[PDB]
Amino acid sequence: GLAVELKQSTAQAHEKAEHSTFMSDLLKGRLGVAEFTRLQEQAWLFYTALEQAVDAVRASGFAESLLDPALNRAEVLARDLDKLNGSSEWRSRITASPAVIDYVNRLEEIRDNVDGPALVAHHYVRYLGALSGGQVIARMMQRHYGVDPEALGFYHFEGIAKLKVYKDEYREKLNNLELSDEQREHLLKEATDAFVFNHQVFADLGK
């Protein structure tokens, strides 16, 4: 089924994502809140773009029940960044890394083409990933760097009580999606590309 096929086809990329030099250093306590803050800045840029694409696709009527607006991160991230940076100064300073420009450009293409199958792939990669190991990341930013849980709002999905049931139900929605063979292959290819973008984001953050 689709949920299982997405996991297996991106398993080796997810393992490569655990081990990027930036994320590895970040999670082991080698960097700092500054570096976490740079990550979240780039994440605000690509979550903002992804969420426009999600809005487009949901409005078209494709995968509507999967595209839960409580998942939206961009506003919560902006609130986290206001706290991390001390003010709203950041919205006029931050610029997209080249990795992020590529990623945003693909999400904007998916938005404008209202490409349901591609959007779902990216939604899976971003949102199921954040729901799944996000707690791990938040815990380490508190443990290693003393970040206030109030500035880790991205990792709380306010509005979700029972997370484990939410994740199981998300995978059921994936499995229940009406897809032709070309739509399924396009989705799976896209999910692989999503991990490729994310790996280059971390590479640029590392540079």
Ligand code: HEM
């Ligand atoms: C490129 C950055 C990352 C992305 C895009 C990502 C994405 C994902 C996705 C999509 C899943 C769900 C897989 C599935 O169940 O089908 C997942 C699960 C998981 N993630 Fe990540 N992840 C990333 C980084 C990390 C990091 C740095 C860790 C820390 C070790 C981590 C820990 C986990 C764990 C433990 C799971 C549990 C497996 C599962 O629920 O299937 N992830 N991630």
